[PDB]
Design a protein around this ligand. Structure first.
Ligand SMILES: Oc1ccc2oc(=S)ccc2c1
Ligand SMILES: [Zn+2]
Length: 257
């Protein structure tokens, strides 16, 4: 139904999902000069040493690398968060050209892509219950710029040929998401939403200030994926990003001065 085309893209989503015009929608532009340093924020705790990746799936709007979230194996804590949030999946949004692709922007700057590491609050028991709560999810957002290759991304890049089309999955065990993190964990944070339907307002966003670098060849392989299923007309999976939404009555806080 919904997608990223002229007739079903982000400007149409509100018809099926009226919360698209809600009070805490994502992504947003991060105006760095009006974000306020909050000295009471904590360092983020990203504990991914025991992460168990299982599978990679082309779901028709991105690809998800899925994790075993049936125990506390890969968790996000600290920063703005109360309690423990378990990693369930990561995915990316990217452009047709290097000058666009990110969902969040920084002083109106668009990056080539954006990584979303999705975590759910363990006090709600599972992901489906968590998305119904205002503090149900924590999404760690990381910008990608094109330059040097990211060695830790290459295992993802090289499996994409096997999940070219919508509905295809492949085994994807023993992938270490620590290889996708920048050096610094300095971040901005604000309350927002899922950036795809159902657009639920359940996310504490944590957006890292330092981008990671990926090579032109790596992002080119993202752009060979297909939105369509096998045996259907080829639509390249590109420009699968929602643009910035109104900030409304929200403040963005910075972990750093
Ligand atoms: O099933 C969904 C739908 C939208 C989502 O959006 C974000 S931002 C994270 C997870 C997610 C899961
Ligand atoms: Zn996303």
């Amino acid at each position: 139904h919904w997608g990223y085309g002229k007739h079903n893209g982000p400007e149409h989503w509100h018809k099926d999902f009226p919360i698209a015009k809600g009070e805490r929608q994502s992504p947003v532009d991060i105006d760095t000069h009006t974000a306020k340093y909050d000295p009471s924020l904590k360092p983020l705790s990203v504990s991914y040493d025991q992460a168990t990746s299982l599978r990679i799936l082309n779901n028709g709007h991105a690809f998800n690398v899925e994790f075993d979230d049936s125990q506390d194996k890969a968790v996000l804590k600290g920063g703005p968060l109360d309690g423990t949030y378990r990693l369930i999946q990561f995915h990316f949004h990217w452009g047709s050209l290097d000058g666009q692709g990110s969902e969040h922007t920084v002083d109106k700057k668009k990056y080539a892509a954006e990584l979303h590491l999705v975590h759910w609050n363990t006090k709600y028991g599972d992901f489906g219950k968590a998305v119904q709560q205002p503090d149900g999810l924590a999404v760690l957002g990381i910008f990608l710029k094109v330059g040097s290759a990211k060695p830790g991304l290459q295992k993802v890049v090289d499996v994409l040929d096997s999940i070219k089309t919508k509905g295809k999955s492949a085994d994807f065990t023993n992938f270490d998401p620590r290889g996708l993190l920048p050096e610094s964990l300095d971040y901005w944070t604000y309350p927002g939403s899922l950036t795809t339907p159902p657009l639920l307002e359940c996310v504490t966003w944590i957006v890292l200030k330092e981008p990671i670098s990926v090579s032109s060849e790596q992002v080119l392989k993202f752009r060979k994926l297909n939105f369509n299923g096998e045996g259907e007309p080829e639509e390249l999976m590109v420009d699968n990003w929602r643009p910035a939404q109104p900030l409304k009555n929200r403040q963005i806080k910075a972990s750093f001065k």
